[model samples]
Structure formats: structure tokens, C-alpha cells
Target: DGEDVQALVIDNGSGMCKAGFAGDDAPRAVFPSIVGRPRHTGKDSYVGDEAQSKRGILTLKYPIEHGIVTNWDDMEKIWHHTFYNELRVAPEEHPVLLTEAPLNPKANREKMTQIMFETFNTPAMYVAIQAVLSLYASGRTTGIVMDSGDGVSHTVPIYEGYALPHAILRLDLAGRDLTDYMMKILTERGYSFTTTAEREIVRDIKEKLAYVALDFEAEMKAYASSSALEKSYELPDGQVITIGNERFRCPEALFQPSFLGMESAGIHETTYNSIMKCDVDIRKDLYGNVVLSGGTTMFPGIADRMNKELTALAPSTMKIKIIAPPERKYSVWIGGSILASLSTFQQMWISKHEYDESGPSIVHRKCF
Candidate 1:
């Protein structure tokens, strides 16, 4: 019963795997959701810190790709590293709370149930939908959870606490693609840095430099008018790189996917269409409760931009609000972090005994 008040909350997102206990302000271990092995061949293995240290030396493979756990072998290793090597806690005793992506296959859920109970022997388990958890992080149980993460993005409509499956919309382009776009810009301008540290530097450059512009063409004109919009970064090896219009343009994919040649609607349209798909009565409430989560959404002026775009598409009387909590980048993890500790959530935890009785299918019945 001691586990009732505290639990392990893990989010294996496409970009990173976040793990920490409930009541923690943030995930104690944050690392790329990847594992690696020396490319040639090796009995040696890698993940977490080791993977970072040996990134280019090894063949890096992400277990979770495009928001789904595509390789369980690599995923288990990442989870094992998270518990034993990073968090330094045993998994069996904690009531594990996991966050899953939209339209997670039921078969995979059952397989996941098997892994936690049979393999890890976790005392209890619960899996929460990523979007719904995100909504909770922003202190709202209803709304559209608009998440633009590293690998992909999804706009999920949640009514109260339940997600509307039919209304969900996904944008396949996300932060990772934006980084690629930036890299492309750098390549065309005669710069290339592909090592782990170099790649990380580029990502930071993207984070610090990128901003969503209200008017892409006008911003381009302003940027070209002077060096005012340009900034410089000095590399560790002493070379200085100047970045300007590329900063504003990469994130434009979220607003104008046509640049990337994707037919998908922009992030705002994605949110607007999803809200419209929901039943008529709550559309206003959904509009009023729009919450932002994930790293891609962190670009400055995103909330105001989303609000502006959504307002133009909605009824004039509608109140379209976008909530970008200060901690929204880690919202998915924090959502589970807070929810797992709630007293009313006790029975929500599925015990190992129940798993043994009804097996993996119990996940479908007890969860969701």
C-alpha cells in the first residue's frame, strides 16, 4: 500500500524517454529514446548516457518512432537503463504509470501489459493517454491537447477527461523535421556538423534562434533589411556561424507545411478541424480550453499565433484560448507525475493479481 501514494511515471516519447517518480517536479532521467551498438559488431550495448557518449561510434536506433514503440527489444533496454542505471530504483515495487500515444494498437497494449507484469513484476500498472495527461498538466480536464513533439504532432480533443478518438488529427511533420530543415539551410550555405555534440549544438541553435513569425513573407523582408534579425554562435572549435532568416523559416513548417511539400494542414488548422469534429455543444468549451504541450510548441509567439489563426476560423463570438504552461515542454511527464499520486486514483491501478487472473486483456477492461 505504500506504493499507493507514490509511483514511477514514464513517458517513452518519440524524441526522448522521461522517467521519474510521482511528486517529482520533473523527470529525473531525460535521454534520447534510443539504444545503440557498435556498428561493425559487439557484445557491448548502449543506451542513455552511454549512447550519448558513443553516438556516432554506434548504430543508433530509436525504439519509439513517430510516437509508437516500434522496437520492443531496444525499448526494454532503454527502460532497463532508466531504472537500474539512471533512477537506481527497482521496478517491481512501484505502481508504474505510463503515457501512451493516440490510437495505440490494442495488441500492443496487451503486449505492454505482459511486459510490465510478467517481466518486470510491477506491483500495479496504469497507462494514460498522452493527450489527456497533457490536458491535466495545464489544469484542465477538457479541451484540445495540441502537442508538437520532436518526431510528430497530434491535436487531440478531450471532453472533460476522455479523449474523442474520432476527432484526433495528426501532423506528421514536427520538431525533428524542422531541425532537418535547418540543417538543410546550413548545408546549402556550406556548413556541416553531424557528430553528437555538433548535432546537439544545432538543436540548441534551433531552440534559441527559431521563432514563429506572424507573417512569413513580411518577416523575410524585415530580416533582409538589416543584420538586426541575425545572430551568431561560436562553435567549440572556434568557428563562428551566423544564422538569420533560416531561424524563422524552419518552424514555418508548423504553419505552412507546403514548404516541406506535405499536404497536411498546418497546426492551427489541425486544432480547428479537430474541435469542429467533436459534438456541437462542447465546441466552444474545447476552443476555450486549448492546451499546448511538447517541445516544438515552445517556439516564442506560438500561442498568440495559434490563437490568431484559430480565431479567424471560428465563430466571432467564440473564445479561443491557447494555454502554454511554463512547463509545457515536459507536460506529458508531469501530467502522469501528478495524476499517479492522487488518492482517488487507487483502484485505477491494476494489480499484478488481476493481470494473472485475466491476463493482458485486463488492460483493455481496466484502462481507458
Candidate 2:
């Protein structure tokens, strides 16, 4: 089945399906993980990104919410077309590599496996996410993967090839939150948006302007003391802008989690909390290989912040190191692909054979 095997990677963030050979080139096809109906019947057709861009698609709902697959019908339809019609994968292919959320909903997982085995006729499939990242980092048996992606902040703790329950925490904050904050600030500054067209613009501004300060009070004061001439500037539209000292302020919401009012812990503190939730025996090893692999990790001082904070939170005798992926955005996808290459990985999979042999009840066993 060398030539027949296919790997499918689905991300809830952008609603995309990326698939290709296991160890060859990059993804062969990347399709929007979205599906929706147009206003009319014959004249209107179901389009993904194009309709959202051109037509006034008012109800462009994301199949994914908070970085997890929720919309089943459209998601299934989109994946079906991408695989059978677009990528041209055949039914005879027994095993397929598929990626899902770190901790996907039980209902969604059942529906997905059923759709794969029933509709497209896929005989076998494997599912994995954050836990697989431990393999990519050091082939270690235990570690924590902090994923800062589109919708939420996910802290997944893995020990001996298994994700620790209750140890997995998700903060409803991430790049999306930053984007919204930026959009609000721009609107306050006279950047009115008539449509979603300005969403990308707002996102870009956040990426450019957002910074996490090590010393919020000191930095703010230093900037506040700058000369009036140095702080004033003219806009491209011929508008003069004057700044009265403070040029920057750290978005403490990203840190000092208390800013958002949930137990009042910082990001690093929360990370330590999640790590402590893991078995006490493996706690030492978990901190040794904490991997930061998500978009939020791209922030200027994030790596250093995580290191300093985690160091302060952990015991003085313990060591904390934050290792980022070569390409943070693609780490989970790459980790999923790499995990598929493991020999014992096959045993971890619950393929079509098990589904047909044991029936739907097999899905409840927590095979991973």
C-alpha cells in the first residue's frame, strides 16, 4: 500500500484540508475546510473562499470555532470533494492519515470516523494532534506542547505517549483576541469598517504593533518621558499626530492572566499549573521538554517570557526550557505527519477494520 497510502491534514483554524504522500513533498492539495450555500439555487453555487471575497456572503460561518471542528455537514462535504474529486484519492487505499483538534468533541470524532468509513469508503485512518508533538521534539515519552493558534490557547501535557486528562487546559484567548482588540482600537481611531474586508488589515496591524513588555511600568514610564518633538508625527493623510509620552504598553491580558479575571495567574503561571496537573513523577521530565509551537509564540518576547516565568514558577532545582518549532504555524501539522511515520504508531490507530469488527462501541475505548 506504499503508493496507495494517503495523508490528510485538517485544521480547524482556517477550515483547510491538506493532504499528500506520507514522506514525500509537502501537501498536494489545500482546500478550504468550509462549505455553505449561496443565495440562489441554479445561479448560486457553494463556494469557499471566493464567495467570501467576491460575493457578499453574509453568513460565512466558520466550520471551526475556538480552533475545533464543530460544523459537521459542511466540513464533511468539503473534505469529500477535496479527497475524491479534487485530490482523486481512491477507495482501495486502506490507511489514511487524518488530523483533528487536540481534544476533539466525542460526537464530532464519531461523526468523522463514520463519514470516512461509510461515505468515502476509507478502510483505515489514524488521528492525532498535540501529543504527537512530543515525538517531534525529542522522541520523548513525556512533555508539554503549548499551541497558540487561531482561536484558543491549548496546553497539552503528554506522558508516556498519552495525554494527561484534566492537565489539558484551553484558554479562550489567542491571535483572534488580539485581532479583535486591534480592530476596536483602529475603529476608535477613525478606521471605520463597512465590511469584513478590513479584517485582514486589522490583523496585520496587530502583528506589527503588538508587543509584550518585560517591565510594563518601567517601559511605559520611559516612553512617557520622551520629548514632545520625538513623539509627534504626521500621518500619510496629512493629519498631524501628537503623542504625550507613552508610545507603547504591554497587553498584560496575554500575561498576568488576572487582567482577564480568571484566578489571576500569568501565562507562564497557567502553563505551570497545567504541567503540575500531570502525574507528579513525570513532572520533572515534562518541564525539560516544554515545546512552544503555535502562532502566539511568534510574539517578540514570548520565548524569553515563557523561560523566565516558568523558571520562577518551578522549583529552583528544576530546569525549564521553551523550544519553538522551526515554523511555529505548521508545527502541529508536521508533528502529525511525523507521528504517522512511527512503527508502533500503527497499533495506536483504530482503523476501519476495528470499526467494522467491533462496531461504533469501539470509538469509546480511548485507543490513544
Candidate 3:
């Protein structure tokens, strides 16, 4: 009976951890990717939102760094709390499906497999690339997927459900970078934030006010001419700050990373480059079916901006289409749900018995 139960799907992103049952429309639990260990001995540690709430005194630790788990102890604590304490799941009773960033280190995969089998003792497990999952979420097996999440932005080309890893391009410019830039701008404007908790104000300001400008120079000139571009944001403590050109400038980093001194190409250029790196025969299909996922991609005007930029660079004979779902932030999680619920996908999971015989390296062969 336990074997017949639905698998649990987890998208452990750098910014947030999303977990839920296989067929759910959205994550049952979404929380920050931090764990708080208190200084006082015997006091229970907190994870996610609870950890964020206990800001000043508690020492906050993160399991993931640059979209990959760097500390297994912190990662274990996060998983344990998320499963047992939050989602109320018995790990031993069901299979599990997880999402991984493109080009995730082999050692990370081995450790994750070990955690699933040796620690959680799940019946079966599977890990899928986030970009591929994003493509799957759009109900297409082939396309170019642009995932600009918290820690990293990746452009990946998918050909019939298989990610073209050789053509994948990544940049350090993402949500966190935008937030940090916002913080810098706000600080220069006399807004003070002493603790990490207060930095959420900057993030909120970015999400609420920032946007990608179709013509950055024109927008900046327009803003400089009048006060219409300026808007006020009230911080948590009731302090209001007036923002002007900073609104569009922060998100412009995605389109022009050179503003921050990053050498990598912008998202549009990278997407084009990724498709160009692929086989010429598939280039048309990839261009006509570009998919955008990840929380950062949800910013207003991003899709239109991408479409405009890509169209200008693309061949005159080719058609360009950008698919940005309303639920772009949770697209990968939704894709996992779709995959895990499929009847045929059940047979694809790596069984515990198989793992016992082949060990952790089997994950590469079985899941990939």
C-alpha cells in the first residue's frame, strides 16, 4: 500500500524550498532557504519563515550557496524540518522527486542520492534538471528555457526532453543581485538597514517597483525630465523613501549585466547564444518556443523586453515566441508534479534495491 502512494516533489531552490504532493498546482510549503540555530543551548532551532522572524539573536545558516547545497548538516536539518515538521510526511513511505540546477556538481548528486536512500530511506527517487523541468511545465518537450532564479540565471536548450548541456549558459546576475543593487541604491539615498531581516525591505521594494525597461536610455532620460517616474516606498518601520530611475535601473542588470561589471552576456544575448550553439536544424523550433521560468523572470515587462531583444537579434526568416507563464516562479515545481503523476514516470524512479546494488553513482545513470 505504501508503494502505491504518490511521490513527494521538492524544488529546493537557492531562495526558497518548495515541497508538495505530486499533482498539486502549487507547493504545499514554501519557505526561505535558511535555518536559524539559536545561541541559547536546549532551545529548538527554526527553519524558513520562523527563522526569518527570529532575526537578530539567532544565528542564521543557509544550506545552499550559488544554487547548490554546500553544507550537508544544514541541508539535512532543512529537509528534516520541511518533511516531518512542516509537510507532515513520512519519508520512508513514499517515493521522492527532486529538481536540480543545470550542471550541478556530480558530488552534489551523489550526496543527494545518499541522503535520499541512506537517510530518508525512500522507496524510490528521481532528480530532474530545473531548466528541463521548466520546459516540461510549459507542456513542451523541446524549447529554450531561461531560468533566472535567486542565485543564478541559466539559459538551456532542450531537444526532445533532453537538455543540451553543452549549449547551457549561466550568469551570476539574478534576483539576489538585483536585491543587493536595490540595497546599494537605497543606502545611497539615506535608507538604513542594519540586519539581514531589514534587507527584506529592499527585496520588497525591488519586487514592487523594479521593472525591465524596453529602452533603458530613453526611460532614464524620461525619468530625469520629470518627477512622474519617482515613487515612494514605505519600509517595515514606517519610513518612506522616494525612488526614481533606480526602479528600472535595478532590473536592467538582466538585460545589461555590464552595468555591474559582470563580463557575461545578458539574458537575451545568452538565450540567443544558447540556441545558436545547438544544431541548426532545431534552431527554428527553439526560437519559436522559448520558455521563461524562475521568480526573477516574473518582473513586469521582462517577457516583452526579452521578446523585443531576441527578435532584433534573430534571423529575419525565423519567428520568435516567448512563453512566460503566470506561475513562472513555481514552474519547475509544477513540472515535477506533472512528471511524478504520470503513470509512465513511476517506472522511471530509481528503486532502493537498485541503489543498494549500484550505490550513489547509479543516480547519474537512472535519473539523468
Clashing pairs in 1: none
Model 1, position 6: C-alpha lDDT score: 59
lDDT of 2 by residue, 1-368 (tens): 14335545443354345555555424556555556566545323353565466446434556777767767666666666666666676754656666666677777667777777887777677666654553464456678887776677777888777778678887776766666655555455565533455666555545555566666676656666755323443444576544331123224566754444445555677679898887788888878888876666676667776887788888898988787655666666566656666666667667777889876556667345
**Model 1, 1-368: lDDT tens per residue?**
13544589899888888889898879888888878888897767798667877877898888887788888878788878877887887888788998889988898898788888888889999988988898988888889999889898999999878999999988788988888777777767678856556667788888988888887789999988988988898877888899888888888889899888888899999999999899999999999999999999999988888988998999899988889998888999999988998887888989998998999999998889
The per-residue C-alpha lDDT of model 2 at residue 130 equals: 50
- Candidate 1 differs from the real structure by a C-alpha RMSD in angstroms, to one decimal, of 1.9
Model 2 spans > 4 angstroms off = 1-4, 14-19, 24-32, 40-48, 84-88, 91-94, 134-138, 189-195, 225-252, 256-266, 343-348
Off by over 4 Å in 3: 1-4, 39-44, 193-195
**Ordering by lDDT:** 3, 1, 2
Worst 10 residues of 2 by lDDT: 242-251
> Model 1 — which ten-residue stretch has the worst lDDT?
1-10
Candidate achieving higher TM-score, 1 or 2? 1
Candidate 1: where is the Cα deviation over 4 Å? 1-5, 193-198
Q: Per-candidate TM vs. native?
A: 0.96, 0.81, 0.95
